[PDB]
């Protein structure tokens, strides 16, 4: 007979040499799922001791236990308050940092005064602890904290000496001001801005983040205020820690939207911002991502900053896939009418390589480059054909389709090379590709005598095909029959028969009849309808609503810079 019963004896034994060692085993078996609890009191009165190793051991027992059983926690109160006096500042801090982790409406009254004391204790390792203990308490009594003056107390600590406290105060304070947006618990008036505009040049790394993220919320309403404030964050554009660099950029980006273009300063703060988020691509793979998701935003809003910088966003064969993807989207974004030469070469390469799934993402890009750089259309079609010549199937299928849509966007203009592409009807399997080929034979049928057996071979296995080619083939054979009637008298019949009798996708069957009826009762109109110039197809979105972009250039540091959703899409 033993187990838990035996650990209870090991502790009580007044030999604080035995206690110390026995405590060790109890703390061990928490982190192994074993339901302790039965030894809660016995651990609590080992508290009454001197050994700093043994005490910070018991606090592990308590704290990772007041966040689980906060109710069976508050019974140790008199012992936590005791240590709030204890000379050793470590056990002073320790009593507060654990006391606040008891989330129960009942502790709002006990902790009130011992925290009031540690809030202006001598030692900063106690004051840093107290500061975030204020927030740890506003969580379980937001009124009580506003009442007992701890609100004004945190407002003190921001002017505190050692930054490790200023840091924690600025954070606990902005965490409250957020939960009460309208109350203006921060306020930030034009005079107390210089207050914290100064601790920003200390407050450890963290805390400079906490500060910058507070200046975001401020808005100078004054051109010469924005200018002198900007020039006071400008240096923080180095502090390693990408979360300071970003946070400083967040600030500058919303202040710089003041003064149109005069005073070289606007011209300058623009040229200043490039190097720092360029050199943000040189951090760890995870932080490169976060910078990328944010540059994708930035070059939308202010193209001018990362203009010359395209070379930076080129893909490195070993960048993690999610950086490759975000780098590609940014090359596209900077693809200038004066560098696609360089860009295309790069995409050409990506398609040549071995990350299959990215090779696809690479060639869609060449299309998106023709959409974006209007004048390059041709060189895009050039390299697309070059890739096709590789007879590498994953590559062809993705290119025939971009071509298909480069045709539909600029004249026909390439009736030339068409007769060629009909060299690859070999391995067009992916439906999306056939549906492109088949359509290109449809239009442009007057330029390929092939058309007959081209479309015929497709028709041989029609009830097996994609509901997409099924439909594109019907629109193609009819096109043919209005272009070369006679050469194709039988085809139109077989299609219409098969769409109409054989196919049971109701939408197909309809178009089956629609054509048959139109052809056979008014052909002079059938040619009028199904032929006739379609307009030039217009792309899609491209950018971001000018109003929502603005809303999340404001949040440049945050998660809402990564997901591009505003803060309401996660809570």
């Amino acid at each position: 007979k033993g187990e838990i019963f035996e650990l209870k004896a090991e502790l009580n034994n007044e030999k604080k040499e035995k206690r110390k060692e026995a405590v060790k085993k109890v703390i061990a078996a928490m982190t192994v799922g074993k339901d302790v609890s039965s030894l809660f009191p016995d651990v609590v009165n080992c508290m009454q001791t001197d050994n700093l190793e043994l005490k910070k051991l018991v606090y592990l027992y308590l704290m990772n236990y007041a966040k689980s059983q906060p109710d069976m926690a508050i019974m140790a109160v008199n012992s936590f308050v005791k240590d709030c006096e204890d000379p050793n500042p470590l056990i002073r801090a320790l009593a507060v940092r654990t006391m606040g982790c008891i989330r129960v409406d009942k502790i709002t009254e006990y902790l009130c005064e011992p925290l009031r004391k540690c809030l202006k204790d001598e030692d900063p390792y106690v004051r840093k602890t107290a500061a975030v203990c204020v927030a740890k308490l506003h969580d379980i009594n937001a009124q009580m904290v506003e009442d007992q003056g701890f609100l004004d107390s945190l407002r003190d600590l921001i002017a505190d000496s050692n930054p490790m406290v200023v840091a924690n105060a600025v954070a606990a304070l902005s965490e409250i001001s957020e939960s009460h947006p309208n109350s203006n618990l921060l306020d930030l008036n034009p005079q107390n801005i210089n207050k914290l505009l100064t601790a920003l040049n200390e407050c450890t790394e963290w805390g400079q983040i906490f500060i910058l993220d507070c200046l975001s919320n401020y808005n100078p309403k004054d051109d010469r205020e924005a200018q002198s404030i900007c020039e006071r964050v400008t240096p923080r554009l180095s502090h390693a820690n990408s979360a300071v660099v970003l946070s400083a950029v967040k600030v500058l980006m919303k202040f710089l939207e003041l003064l149109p273009k005069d005073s070289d300063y606007y011209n300058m703060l623009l040229k200043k911002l490039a190097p720092p988020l360029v050199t943000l691509l040189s951090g760890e793979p995870e932080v490169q991502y976060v910078a990328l998701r944010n540059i994708n935003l930035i070059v939308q809003k202010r193209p001018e900053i990362l203009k010359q910088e395209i070379k930076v966003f080129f893909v490195k064969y070993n960048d993690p896939i999610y950086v490759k993807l975000e780098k590609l989207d940014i090359m596209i974004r900077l693809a200038s009418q004066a560098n696609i030469a360089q860009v295309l070469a790069e995409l050409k390469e990506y398609a040549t390589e071995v990350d299959v799934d990215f090779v696809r993402k690479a060639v869609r890009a060449i299309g998106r480059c023709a959409i974006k750089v209007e004048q390059s259309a041709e060189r895009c079609v050039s390299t697309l054909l070059d890739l096709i010549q590789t007879k590498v199937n994953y590559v062809v299928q993705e290119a025939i389709v971009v071509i298909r849509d480069i045709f539909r966007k600029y004249p026909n203009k390439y009736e030339s090379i068409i007769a060629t592409l009909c060299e690859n009807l070999d391995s067009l399997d992916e439906p999306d590709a056939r549906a492109a080929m088949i359509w290109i034979v449809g239009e442009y049928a007057e330029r390929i005598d092939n058309a007959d057996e081209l479309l015929e071979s497709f028709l041989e296995g029609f009830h097996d095909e994609s509901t997409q080619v099924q439909l594109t083939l019907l629109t193609a054979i009819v096109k043919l029959f209005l272009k070369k009637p006679s050469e194709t008298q039988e085809l139109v019949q077989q299609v219409l028969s098969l769409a109409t009798q054989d196919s049971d996708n109701p939408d197909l069957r309809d178009r089956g009849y629609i054509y048959w009826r139109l052809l056979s009762t008014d052909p002079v109109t059938a040619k009028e309808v199904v032929l006739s110039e379609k307009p030039l197809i217009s792309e899609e979105t491209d950018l971001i609503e000018p109003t929502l972009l603005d809303e999340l250039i404001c949040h440049i540091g945050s998660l809402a810079s990564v997901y591009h959703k505003p803060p309401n899409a996660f809570v």
Binding site: T31, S247, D357, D464
Partner: protein, 409 residues
């Protein structure tokens, strides 16, 4: 800010746990385990949202570790904190392996409540942390090729050949399943080139694919020429290739398989007279790719006397030659489906059948690896001839074949 902090071993079992805000719970942790760690078709990314809860994570060894928040935190920051918390951790015990963490539960849990209060990062940098870390710190830590091979141009091929197996329940339960792997490399390239071979996750550390009523256990075997030095740095299998064709690595996963086809068998025994079967086949890979050479073998009873079907795509034949209907589809894309419906006349018989209805077996082929494997890069470095990694011809194809792919009818 940082509401939680979690550390898993390769398997996804939780090693360390620290909640800093009620927001969390049993929720976000299985949430991360079975959605990021056990991702299948999903391409992982560093920060991932799951149920209005955000998850920052970083892999270090074969060890995952992830912070959870329900707030809109400064994203850059949580990685910056996560980086630091690993640096400190390696200052106290080097490699951040599953061994060293199992050995320091205390040191770590205590280290945490010091580098982070209430989810606020608290500046580590091992600065004076001795006077706060009142705890100890238990540390702990070929394949030949003739000289002077010469080639016209420099090419290399990469076949990822996988045979996925499965025994599924009518209702769709995976009763058992494993991928047999194999990455063959055909290399016609000149010099004495050391090439690096990066892949995605999907494997962690033999027998010629055999067995039946015998249990598939995960594994992995490399070639002699394989330098496994950096496999806990993504992949970076660094090797020096024999000439021509060779078997760079032979494996078999049993975990996060991308079973490419579900079979939905709706039988229906109408007396002992006839028997009406309907079968669906749901493809469920990406739509951007085709399965080919598809076969579906519905077993017929022994007292069959008549059969008629109604095939949507493809065509089917009855072969008493071998007792079963044989449906063949020529090709179908991802995320589509198809159906077939048989009526099966059955000679009266007195009984004796029992049938035991064998499963519906499938035979198919696909442009991906059911293991989830993905060839992420392969860089060739050759210092004597110094030809461009870029002037090396490179093609790769994946080839997922069906093993015994049975769904129970």
């Amino acid at each position: 800010m940082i509401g939680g902090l979690f550390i898993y071993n390769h398997k996804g079992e939780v090693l360390i746990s620290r909640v800093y805000r009620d927001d969390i719970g049993r929720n976000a942790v299985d949430a991360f385990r079975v959605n990021v760690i056990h991702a299948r078709q999903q391409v992982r990314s560093p920060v991932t949202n799951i149920a209005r809860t955000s998850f920052f994570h970083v892999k270090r060894s074969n060890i995952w570790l992830a912070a959870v928040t329900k707030q809109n935190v400064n994203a850059a920051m949580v990685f910056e904190f996560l980086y630091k918390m690993c640096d400190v951790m390696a200052a106290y015990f080097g490699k951040i392996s599953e061994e060293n963490i199992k050995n320091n539960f205390v040191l770590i849990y205590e280290l945490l409540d010091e580098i982070l209060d209430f989810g606020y990062p608290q500046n580590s940098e091992t600065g004076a942390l001795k006077t706060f870390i009142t705890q100890q710190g238990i540390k702990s830590q070929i394949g030949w090729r003739r000289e002077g091979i010469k080639y016209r141009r420099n090419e290399l091929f990469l076949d990822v050949l996988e045979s996925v197996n499965l025994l599924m329940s009518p209702q769709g339960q995976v009763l058992s399943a494993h991928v047999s792997g194999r990455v063959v490399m055909k290399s016609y390239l000149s010099g004495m080139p050391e090439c690096k071979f990066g892949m995605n996750d999907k494997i962690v550390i033999e027998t010629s694919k055999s067995g039946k009523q015998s249990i598939a256990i995960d594994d992995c075997t490399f070639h002699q020429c394989v330098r496994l030095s950096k496999f806990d740095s993504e992949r970076s299998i660094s090797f020096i290739p024999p000439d021509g064709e060779f078997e760079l690595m032979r494996y078999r996963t049993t975990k996060d398989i991308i079973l490419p086809f579900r079979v939905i068998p709706l039988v229906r025994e109408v007396g002992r007279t006839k028997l009406e079967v309907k079968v669906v086949i749901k493809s469920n890979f990406k739509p951007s790719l085709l399965a080919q050479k598809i076969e579906v073998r519905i077993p017929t009873p022994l007292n069959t006397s008549g059969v008629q079907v109604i095939c949507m795509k493809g065509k089917a034949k009855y072969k008493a030659s071998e007792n079963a209907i044989v449906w063949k589809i020529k090709r179908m894309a991802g995320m589509k489906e198809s159906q077939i419906s048989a009526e099966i006349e059955l000679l009266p018989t007195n009984d004796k059948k029992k049938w035991a209805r064998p499963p519906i077996s499938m035979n198919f082929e696909v442009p991906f690896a059911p293991s989830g494997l993905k060839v992420r890069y392969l860089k060739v470095f050759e210092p004597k001839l110094n030809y461009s990694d870029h002037d090396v011809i490179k093609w790769v194809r994946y080839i997922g074949r069906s093993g015994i792919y049975e769904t129970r009818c």
